[PDB]
Write a protein that holds these residues in place. Structure first.
Motif, PDB file in Angstrom:
ATOM      1  N   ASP A  96       9.919  16.106  16.991  1.00 27.98           N
ATOM      2  CA  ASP A  96       8.427  16.593  17.178  1.00 27.98           C
ATOM      3  C   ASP A  96       8.590  17.828  15.422  1.00 27.98           C
ATOM      4  OD1 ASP A  96       7.634  15.617  19.524  1.00 27.98           O
ATOM      5  OD2 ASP A  96       8.073  17.277  20.367  1.00 27.98           O
ATOM      6  N   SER A  97       8.814  18.348  15.450  1.00 29.63           N
ATOM      7  CA  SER A  97       9.226  19.551  14.443  1.00 29.63           C
ATOM      8  C   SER A  97       8.900  18.913  12.895  1.00 29.63           C
ATOM      9  CB  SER A  97      10.450  20.613  14.304  1.00 29.63           C
ATOM     10  OG  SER A  97       9.920  22.004  13.269  1.00 29.63           O
ATOM     11  N   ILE A  98       9.956  18.009  12.078  1.00 27.11           N
ATOM     12  CA  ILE A  98       9.626  17.792  10.769  1.00 27.11           C
ATOM     13  C   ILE A  98       9.127  16.061  11.439  1.00 27.11           C
ATOM     14  N   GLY A  99       8.585  15.883  12.413  1.00 19.78           N
ATOM     15  CA  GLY A  99       7.385  14.649  12.076  1.00 19.78           C
ATOM     16  C   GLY A  99       7.278  13.877  12.195  1.00 19.78           C
ATOM     17  N   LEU A 151      10.229   6.493   8.376  1.00 21.56           N
ATOM     18  CA  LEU A 151      11.498   5.599   9.524  1.00 21.56           C
ATOM     19  C   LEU A 151      12.135   5.683   8.762  1.00 21.56           C
ATOM     20  CD1 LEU A 151      11.772   3.565  11.258  1.00 21.56           C
ATOM     21  CD2 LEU A 151      11.745   1.431  10.031  1.00 21.56           C
ATOM     22  N   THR A 152      12.048   5.679   7.606  1.00 18.23           N
ATOM     23  CA  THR A 152      13.616   6.478   7.234  1.00 18.23           C
ATOM     24  C   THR A 152      14.502   7.979   7.381  1.00 18.23           C
ATOM     25  OG1 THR A 152      13.395   4.776   5.423  1.00 18.23           O
ATOM     26  CG2 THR A 152      15.257   5.926   4.945  1.00 18.23           C
ATOM     27  N   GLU A 153      13.954   8.742   7.548  1.00 22.39           N
ATOM     28  CA  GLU A 153      13.985   9.778   8.087  1.00 22.39           C
ATOM     29  C   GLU A 153      14.647   9.396   9.569  1.00 22.39           C
ATOM     30  OE1 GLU A 153      14.628  12.625   5.801  1.00 22.39           O
ATOM     31  OE2 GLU A 153      15.073  10.929   4.707  1.00 22.39           O
ATOM     32  N   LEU A 154      13.612   9.506  10.387  1.00 25.98           N
ATOM     33  CA  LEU A 154      13.962   8.985  11.244  1.00 25.98           C
ATOM     34  C   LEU A 154      15.303   8.028  11.563  1.00 25.98           C
ATOM     35  CD1 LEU A 154      13.043   9.538  14.777  1.00 25.98           C
ATOM     36  CD2 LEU A 154      12.158   7.362  14.351  1.00 25.98           C
ATOM     37  N   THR A 155      15.293   7.447  11.089  1.00 21.77           N
ATOM     38  CA  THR A 155      17.299   7.040  10.645  1.00 21.77           C
ATOM     39  C   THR A 155      17.780   7.699  10.427  1.00 21.77           C
ATOM     40  OG1 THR A 155      15.790   5.041  10.874  1.00 21.77           O
ATOM     41  CG2 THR A 155      18.026   4.953  10.473  1.00 21.77           C
ATOM     42  N   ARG A 156      17.709   8.511   9.356  1.00 17.39           N
ATOM     43  CA  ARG A 156      18.431   9.293   8.846  1.00 17.39           C
ATOM     44  C   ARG A 156      18.490  10.716  10.543  1.00 17.39           C
ATOM     45  N   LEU A 157      17.820  11.431  10.564  1.00 21.04           N
ATOM     46  CA  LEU A 157      18.160  12.403  12.178  1.00 21.04           C
ATOM     47  C   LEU A 157      18.824  11.620  13.048  1.00 21.04           C
ATOM     48  CD1 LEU A 157      15.533  14.577  12.712  1.00 21.04           C
ATOM     49  CD2 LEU A 157      17.267  12.649  15.178  1.00 21.04           C
ATOM     50  N   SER A 176       0.855  -1.104  -0.375  1.00 21.79           N
ATOM     51  CA  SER A 176       0.139  -0.054  -0.091  1.00 21.79           C
ATOM     52  C   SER A 176       0.557   1.921   0.186  1.00 21.79           C
ATOM     53  CB  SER A 176      -1.004   0.089   0.949  1.00 21.79           C
ATOM     54  OG  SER A 176      -0.370   0.222   2.378  1.00 21.79           O
ATOM     55  N   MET A 177       0.258   2.540  -0.739  1.00 25.54           N
ATOM     56  CA  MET A 177       0.476   3.523   0.159  1.00 25.54           C
ATOM     57  C   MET A 177       0.874   4.355   1.136  1.00 25.54           C
ATOM     58  SD  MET A 177       2.798   5.131  -2.486  1.00 25.54           S
ATOM     59  CE  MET A 177       3.588   6.375  -1.647  1.00 25.54           C
ATOM     60  N   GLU A 178       0.146   4.055   1.736  1.00 27.46           N
ATOM     61  CA  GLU A 178       0.023   4.373   3.530  1.00 27.46           C
ATOM     62  C   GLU A 178       1.732   3.405   4.002  1.00 27.46           C
ATOM     63  N   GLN A 179       1.718   1.995   3.585  1.00 33.66           N
ATOM     64  CA  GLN A 179       2.563   1.304   4.502  1.00 33.66           C
ATOM     65  C   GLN A 179       4.168   2.538   3.601  1.00 33.66           C
ATOM     66  OE1 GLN A 179       3.515  -1.049   6.472  1.00 33.66           O
ATOM     67  NE2 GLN A 179       1.519  -0.777   7.142  1.00 33.66           N
ATOM     68  N   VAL A 180       4.187   2.815   2.839  1.00 28.67           N
ATOM     69  CA  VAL A 180       5.690   3.236   1.885  1.00 28.67           C
ATOM     70  C   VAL A 180       5.805   4.369   2.621  1.00 28.67           C
ATOM     71  CG1 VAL A 180       6.608   4.678  -0.159  1.00 28.67           C
ATOM     72  CG2 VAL A 180       4.988   2.003  -0.455  1.00 28.67           C
ATOM     73  N   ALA A 181       4.581   4.922   2.770  1.00 30.67           N
ATOM     74  CA  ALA A 181       5.359   6.796   3.322  1.00 30.67           C
ATOM     75  C   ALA A 181       5.364   6.890   5.075  1.00 30.67           C
ATOM     76  CB  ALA A 181       3.698   7.214   3.355  1.00 30.67           C
ATOM     77  N   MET A 182       5.062   5.602   5.747  1.00 36.56           N
ATOM     78  CA  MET A 182       5.280   5.326   6.871  1.00 36.56           C
ATOM     79  C   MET A 182       7.087   4.574   6.898  1.00 36.56           C
ATOM     80  SD  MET A 182       2.341   3.811   9.577  1.00 36.56           S
ATOM     81  N   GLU A 183       6.851   4.264   5.861  1.00 38.79           N
ATOM     82  CA  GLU A 183       8.312   3.367   6.021  1.00 38.79           C
ATOM     83  C   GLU A 183       9.364   4.867   5.264  1.00 38.79           C
ATOM     84  OE1 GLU A 183       7.938   0.546   3.159  1.00 38.79           O
ATOM     85  OE2 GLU A 183       7.326  -0.940   4.750  1.00 38.79           O
ATOM     86  N   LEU A 184       9.056   5.611   4.637  1.00 36.34           N
ATOM     87  CA  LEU A 184       9.605   6.519   3.999  1.00 36.34           C
ATOM     88  C   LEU A 184       9.688   7.711   5.294  1.00 36.34           C
ATOM     89  N   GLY A 244      15.568  -0.394  13.751  1.00 32.02           N
ATOM     90  CA  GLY A 244      15.285  -0.517  14.057  1.00 32.02           C
ATOM     91  C   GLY A 244      14.548   0.490  15.860  1.00 32.02           C
ATOM     92  N   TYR A 245      15.265   1.267  15.623  1.00 33.83           N
ATOM     93  CA  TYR A 245      14.280   2.651  16.303  1.00 33.83           C
ATOM     94  C   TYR A 245      13.060   2.951  15.688  1.00 33.83           C
ATOM     95  CZ  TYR A 245      19.001   2.329  19.318  1.00 33.83           C
ATOM     96  OH  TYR A 245      20.037   1.658  20.234  1.00 33.83           O
ATOM     97  N   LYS A 246      12.040   3.151  16.722  1.00 28.02           N
ATOM     98  CA  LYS A 246      10.870   2.635  15.592  1.00 28.02           C
ATOM     99  C   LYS A 246      10.684   4.416  16.008  1.00 28.02           C
ATOM    100  N   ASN A 247      11.053   5.713  17.269  1.00 33.23           N
ATOM    101  CA  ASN A 247      10.817   6.672  17.888  1.00 33.23           C
ATOM    102  C   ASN A 247      11.947   7.190  19.562  1.00 33.23           C
ATOM    103  OD1 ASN A 247      10.377   6.013  20.883  1.00 33.23           O
ATOM    104  ND2 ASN A 247       8.102   5.430  19.790  1.00 33.23           N
ATOM    105  N   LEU A 248      11.932   8.390  18.662  1.00 34.55           N
ATOM    106  CA  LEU A 248      13.086   8.769  19.404  1.00 34.55           C
ATOM    107  C   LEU A 248      13.063   8.136  20.610  1.00 34.55           C
ATOM    108  CD1 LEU A 248      15.571  10.798  20.389  1.00 34.55           C
ATOM    109  CD2 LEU A 248      14.163  13.196  20.637  1.00 34.55           C
ATOM    110  N   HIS A 249      11.543   8.328  21.613  1.00 35.31           N
ATOM    111  CA  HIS A 249      11.979   7.739  23.257  1.00 35.31           C
ATOM    112  C   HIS A 249      13.061   6.381  22.934  1.00 35.31           C
ATOM    113  CE1 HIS A 249      10.905   7.113  26.874  1.00 35.31           C
ATOM    114  NE2 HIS A 249      10.552   5.542  26.201  1.00 35.31           N
TER     115      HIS A 249
END
Length: 121
Positions: A118-121, A11-17, A1-9, A67-72
């Motif tokens: 938070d800011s870049i979501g 996750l990838t941006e979080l991973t970069r940060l 799905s496109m929703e799954q792709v967007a969620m993956e994007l 493997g990190y879903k969030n900053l927490h």
């Protein structure tokens, strides 16, 4: 799905940060005290003391598998590094003092990373 792709994007941006956050935190440890897992060969009793060992290399392996879903999650692992060291080692040691400095200095970095996540979501 496109929703799954967007969620993956996301996750990838979080991973970069988080990769940049990790490099900045690790620079606060120029002695490389926290670079690698504590060796069970050299501290055979370590797991009797510390139940959840952590180090920068183990964090990095987890990060590169996204493997990190969030900053927490990532902060939990950073805190384990510091907290384990301050329990195992006495106050008057180079190890304990290195953890205090990493905590204090890393606090600055994490304060702004929380705003960026938070800011870049």
């Amino acid at each position: 799905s496109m929703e799954q792709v967007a969620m993956e994007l996301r996750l990838t941006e979080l991973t970069r940060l988080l990769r940049s956050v990790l490099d900045q935190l690790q620079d606060k440890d120029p002695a490389r005290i926290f670079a690698q897992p504590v060796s069970l060969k050299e501290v055979p009793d370590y797991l009797d003391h510390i139940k959840h060992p952590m180090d920068f290399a183990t964090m990095r392996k987890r990060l590169e598998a996204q493997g990190y879903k969030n900053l927490h999650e990532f902060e939990e692992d950073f805190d384990l590094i510091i907290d384990n060291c301050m329990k195992y080692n006495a106050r008057d040691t180079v190890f304990y003092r290195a953890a205090v400095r990493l905590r204090d200095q890393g606090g600055v970095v994490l304060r702004q990373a929380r705003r960026e996540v938070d800011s870049i979501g």
